[PDB]
Design a protein around this ligand. Structure first.
Ligand SMILES: *[C@@H]1O[C@H](CO)[C@@H](O)[C@H](O)[C@H]1NC(C)=O
Ligand SMILES: *[C@@H]1O[C@H](CO)[C@@H](O)[C@H](O)[C@H]1NC(C)=O
Ligand SMILES: [Ca+2]
Ligand SMILES: [Ca+2]
Ligand SMILES: [Ca+2]
Ligand SMILES: [Ca+2]
Lengths: 397, 276, 96, 397, 132, 397
């Protein structure tokens, strides 16, 4: 696959640097790389595709070497260069499509798609050009056992999950208390509600906790913590836990007090932030414990006193919320982002040719189901397909 | 089955909620109408219970599921009202000077009171907090409460002198007496006639509705004066003819049952808390 | 050294050279639960003014920080106007 | 600093370009750079660390050169280069951490970390390779006084502050009027609320103004302005200004009419937009003046007429909102971002080794204080530490 | 920047501020404990309050050293620049205020304004070396 | 580290093969290897220790080569061999202890212990002798992945956890039904109990299920499955779930009928056995699902009929249990065993010197917590310290 990246990089440099009028001093090294690629690929043969609707294609290479005598590139040069470049771009595109549709339970990182398996041979070691892009760099730094890292902007680490826990409930659903939460993308959004407004809680302080177990550790995470979870901040009616009836939720938002955000790694508190909103930093963490509290207002205007009665009806229900946005982070295992197109590209090239549902990846590459259980086989296959996706996106847009 | 334990339950919000249940709560439960005798007196019939049963059958309730109960009047029905019956409606005609009796009955039969006996002759009884009352039921409940100092001496009343006591209910069939929560009291109430129970107010009884057949919004279930809640089950309908009243109930019986609910304390799921 | 006034104002500052540093609440709140607190009869402001005008030594700086009377008497013997002014300030603040 | 970045650059390029099979044409210049680095750093002793818990590590360099008579690289070349490269990478990582953990009240831009201070000497001037990265380029363009610029996505310029002002109030808190606002990172959300819905205001319009002064000019900023501030568009119970008693809030979201947003530099009006929501541009602005108006609707349907009476109660409180997100911008001085990870790197390195609170930066590097007070000394130190963090992040993730 | 560089208490006359960015003056009005009956007639216990007690402080910065440029009472750089502008009626520019008004030039003194001021001041010194 | 192992192997083989009267033909190659080791280590200086109570020491090597002009070794040769080899063994022991006592949350594979870090240079690759041991071989393979596996005898893969769940319960705990289990080391013992003997279950059959989630996949495991969980076949009194009260337990052991055991990997069933006891196999499994049943016996002798009434009292409580021993297995990652003392050596080295608890490992190398939270950084550090202890055990016992 490193050789595949080298092909992609040298064709990208051919398409960019070899332009009409350039000095040959600008492209001497690139032309040498291109001629090495041509010589190595000449006389070989490749078969690509044959899974789903991806057609079988035969590639046979026999091309003339690019000239090197010219002092200053002219229009004659770029025509021959373009003729060769188009074929090579098509070949690399098809090889990447094949490899990113294939899939394997066992030995995921190894190359499928026998074209790429051939490219992994010994003849094609001379084409290795350089490995600078982030994904191939992580690929090599992981092939040799060394720590790797991908920087992610808005990493969708949380699988989509909107739900609620009721620590106190009745069939009438008239006096409830508990938490609700939506974890989606890089958003945690959790609102603890109490219908009695902590009337009978000890010291008129209800206590709420919410755990969120990351499927993979995050590093150097910049986070944005705000109060007043906006999702759970308007009236709703919610189907019951069983699914039989529906209960009414009518929030009035108290301020959350003595909030503690604890970022945990292996159960050990790595960081703690008490009542510190705005941007925050988590150096390294695998789990998040958000603890907040609903304290009854000791003093009360007549209006708010009318809002909170001592009797049963409770026409309004107190609520206190938090919102936590992982603005950016660093992670070892590959993920999906709001800044990178690799997940969408892989899913698109799978959907294009009607590839049948495979062993490890869920049907349709539903990222929520892929991240909800993230087995090492899935991790290996996902890194492989994402690396090929980046290699392909370096040429095909 | 983990009876008698507060165990949190997690429920999602993507789940598609299930189908209707009116047919179940009709084919299984038992509707139960409590009306005053003056109703039947004006109706001047006696196949009419059967006719109402047939109309309820047209509306869905099986034949044996809708059961009728009479009572001479609200004040007499007030004494030990036990609605041993699955979905209760109480038609309650309103007349002047019975506002407090109506409110007392509404509180008693709409809110689940759990309560313990009181030996008036022996102990001095104190009210804990906002949700504790003493309910006295009988033919003539003349409760005479004498408060007590911190030394157990009367104020405004002499413990040996019944006369100077402070009456708070005279010859009432039902009386929900509320005293200054925090003080010992010595009661005297006619033990041969009227029983008294130290009761306190659990959550609401979601199984009994009250149809005030007469006038204005005068029910105050909450003894607190600041709050005057309008519960869903304290319905109110104008009247000039009991046939029209009953036809309204029959027509909108679906809505009334939607307002009501299965009694929480009757559920098996409440087994080891206060199941009844 | 982390110092607190009873009327909100707070400071933090080294010992050897009284150059104040940004205060760290949620460290002070944790420390004060357990550590041995010291009364500050020589306020941080007057202490810094004294160090700048006179230039006390390390030992005397530490003893002034700890309000050691064995050494705090020495300045009042010397007629050190900063410590004088501070102590009459307290005595005049002992009204009512 | 320039020499440090050059070391990091050449090590990254050696880790990438120098791989097995590569032509020597692709690595000739980098091999010459690497040889010169080896020669100049041979026989030199560095001593990094020695503050907080950062271990004191001694570095001594005795490394051989790299060959030139090859045609294609092979395992021997790569193996020797790998052994040398790992050592230099660790050395550079520790030098960067040592320079990040340190501060200086005076002379912030000048280097700390005696290892790097030694690197700054005349002896090592031959290592400078090319200062391509954005941070180092701005380091040079500011080290000799020229016009710099950092491009930011969602620049968290505003310090966190959620608060309110009341232009009309009274202890029963029944008839209020004023503004609430939350400035957080890159988003302003301001809501002007009148409990009487502008009953007695002149022409039944109540004017609201909100002035937010940035701590640094932002150049060529793209902004998203929308109405209906989310977070002040639902019922709440809020403290008093003195914290004595809590008052109820119950918004009905009127729209804002004849809303103006003015982007001002040095008092002068640079840009002004008049009831024009969506994507907008600000050439320069040291401050933003959002002005809007709550107009009582003249023609009221019976429902809204019931909502807004002429009596005293005012059971529902009229509001008009605005939200404003700086989607991107360019600033003359560094700031934290939703895209970058420089602040995260710096704070994490401080927290790992428990560096005591230094002269200039606040405890924990909390961005709210660090941007609330942005003295030139703090700016200089933040720029130095961020450049070092970028230099580290080139190699280490 | 919240860094108490110097504190002078009960001092008058010449003083030195080694380095500073804000001046935090504090004083007190102490009612006279004893009073000549003239002063007693001045200050009553009742409401009228014909005479109003006051306390004062004057603080003149004699000389200073500033990292950036500033107008001063010794050299004529600001006057030279403003004279050259007014003599030829230069329209308003982007950064400077109209008329080179020093008050609004120093209330808002952003880096762009500061460096433009440095450029024009250095050029004015260069000119004053020859033309006066 | 390969160099460190090669040092240990050559010293062990020198101590063994270089004995009096042995032919030089037996030890010619070993003498050549030893002389290469001497020449490579000669004229160097190492330093070892400086953490906890492990005291600093300095090692300096000026030793002469062993002779070679001897056809048959004699006593006076072995004395020079002693004077060299004893010093070398001490040096290796202290290097291994120093490497074991250190840690790193990141890049834990790369050597700590600046002595070993120096040994990981370029001058010392000439000492590489042969990597025969299981741990060093797997180190090489993992560091450049081929599929690997450590064979373990009775591996303590489970964490010590004994607990119980009640599917049915009362506050007075008269009529329970549920499961109890103890997972400890390589033992799973799970007993499902019913106080009514499945009197009111559907078809008088009560269904019990237990899930055990291995922290890491095991391969080619051998599992001894037997009925009648021993630990839950005598009377007890157990603290309640809340801990408020204690409930009596009085087993009567019925057999478990139609017992099924499913070994799953990544959610799919890999092996399944039904009513099979004795030794069995698990190909490659990450979870174990033990399902069994409590069937009320249809025909009942007078004694058992007296035991099981139809009324509430239930003086005797029916239970059915299983026991499951993972006798041996193959794990890609490393675990402690009952046959290998690597964990004991690591913990003893840390304990004797009282090392401060580092970022990664738990306090005191608590294996239960360590296997409960077994993140990849922790795994890498564990593998490093275990292979170092394997190297040390070749010489020091
Ligand atoms: C619910 O009702 C729909 C039609 O109203 C019917 O198709 C469906 O089968 C019903 N589902 C159940 C569970 O009764
Ligand atoms: C209440 O007072 C009457 C006096 O009229 C007395 O006969 C009666 O015994 C008293 N009740 C009790 C319960 O003692
Ligand atoms: Ca009554
Ligand atoms: Ca009296
Ligand atoms: Ca009461
Ligand atoms: Ca009331």
């Amino acid at each position: 696959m490193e050789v595949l990246y080298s092909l992609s990089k040298t064709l990208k440099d051919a398409r960019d640097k070899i332009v009409e009028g350039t000095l040959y001093s600008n492209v001497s090294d690139l032309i040498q790389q291109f001629n090495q690629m041509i010589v190595t690929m000449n006389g070989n043969d490749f078969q690509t595709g044959g899974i789903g609707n991806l057609p079988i294609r035969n590639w046979t290479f026999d091309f003339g070497l690019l000239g090197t005598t010219l002092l200053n590139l002219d229009a004659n040069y770029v025509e021959t260069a373009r003729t060769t470049i188009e074929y090579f771009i098509d070949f690399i595109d098809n090889v990447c499509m094949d490899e990113m549709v294939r899939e394997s339970q066992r030995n995921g990182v190894a190359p499928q798609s026998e074209a790429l398996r051939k490219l992994a041979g010994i003849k094609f070691k001379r084409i290795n050009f350089n490995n600078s892009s982030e994904y191939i760099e992580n690929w090599n730094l992981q092939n040799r056992r060394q720590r790797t890292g991908f920087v992610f902007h808005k990493p969708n680490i949380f699988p989509y999950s909107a739900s609620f826990t009721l620590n106190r409930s009745q069939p009438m659903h008239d006096n409830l208390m508990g938490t609700m939460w939506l974890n989606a993308g890089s958003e945690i959004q959790v609102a603890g509600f109490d219908y009695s407004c902590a009337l009978n809680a000890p010291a008129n302080i209800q206590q709420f906790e919410h755990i969120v177990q990351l499927r993979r550790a995050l590093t150097t995470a910049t986070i944005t913590l705000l109060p007043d979870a906006e999702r759970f901040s308007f009236p709703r009616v919610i189907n019951s836990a069983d699914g039989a009836t529906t209960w009414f939720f009518n929030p009035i938002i108290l301020r959350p007090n003595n909030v503690e955000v604890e970022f945990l790694l292996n159960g050990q508190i790595i960081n703690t932030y008490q009542a510190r909103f705005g941007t925050i930093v988590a150096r390294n963490f695998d789990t998040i414990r958000l603890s907040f509290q609903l304290m009854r207002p000791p003093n009360m205007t007549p209006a708010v006193n009318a809002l909170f009665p001592q009797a049963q009806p409770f026409q309004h229900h107190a609520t206190v919320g938090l919102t936590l946005r992982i603005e950016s982070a660093v992670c070892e295992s590959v993920l999906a982002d709001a800044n990178e197109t690799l997940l969408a590209n892989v899913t698109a090239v799978r959907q294009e040719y009607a590839i049948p549902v495979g062993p490890v990846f869920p049907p349709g590459m539903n990222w929520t189901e892929l991240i909800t259980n993230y087995s090492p086989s899935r991790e290996d296959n996902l890194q492989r397909v994402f690396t090929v996706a980046s290699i392909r996106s370096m040429l095909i847009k | 089955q983990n009876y008698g334990l507060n165990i949190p339950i997690t429920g999602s919000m993507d789940t598609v909620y299930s189908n209707s249940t009116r047919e179940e709560v009709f084919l299984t439960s038992t509707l139960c109408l409590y009306y005053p005798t003056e109703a039947s007196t004006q109706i001047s019939d006696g196949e009419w219970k059967d006719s109402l049963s047939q109309m309820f059958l047209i509306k869905g309730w099986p034949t044996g599921s809708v059961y009728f109960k009479e009572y001479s009047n609200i004040v007499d029905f007030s004494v030990d009202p036990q609605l041993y019956c699955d979905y209760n409606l109480v038609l309650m005609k309103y007349d002047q000077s019975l506002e407090l009796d109506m409110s007392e009955l509404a509180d008693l039969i709409l809110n689940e009171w759990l309560c313990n006996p009181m030996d008036i002759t022996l102990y001095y009884y104190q009210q804990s907090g906002e949700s504790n009352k003493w309910i006295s039921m009988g033919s003539s409940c003349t409760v005479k409460v004498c408060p007590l100092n911190t030394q157990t001496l009367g104020i405004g009343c002499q413990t040996t002198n019944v006369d100077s006591f402070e009456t708070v209910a005279e010859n009432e069939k039902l009386a929900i007496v509320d005293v200054v929560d925090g003080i010992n009291h010595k009661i005297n109430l006619t033990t041969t006639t009227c029983t008294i129970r130290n009761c306190k107010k659990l959550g609401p009884r979601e199984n009994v509705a009250v149809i005030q057949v007469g006038g204005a919004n005068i029910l105050d279930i909450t003894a607190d004066p600041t709050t005057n809640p309008q519960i869903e089950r304290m319905m109110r309908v104008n009247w000039k003819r009991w046939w029209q009243v009953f036809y309204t109930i029959v027509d909108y019986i679906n809505q009334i049952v939607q307002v009501m609910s299965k009694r929480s304390r009757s559920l098996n799921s409440a087994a080891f808390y206060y199941r009844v | 050294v982390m110092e607190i006034n009873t009327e909100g104002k707070f400071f933090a500052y080294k010992i050897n050279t009284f150059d104040e540093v940004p205060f760290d609440v949620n460290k002070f709140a944790e420390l004060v639960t357990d550590s041995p607190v010291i009364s500050a009869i020589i306020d941080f402001k007057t202490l810094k003014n004294l160090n700048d005008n006179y230039g006390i030594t390390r030992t005397e700086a530490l003893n002034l920080i700890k309000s050691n009377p064995n050494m705090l008497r020495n300045f009042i013997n010397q007629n050190n106007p900063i410590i004088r002014n501070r102590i009459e300030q307290l005595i005049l603040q002992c009204k009512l």
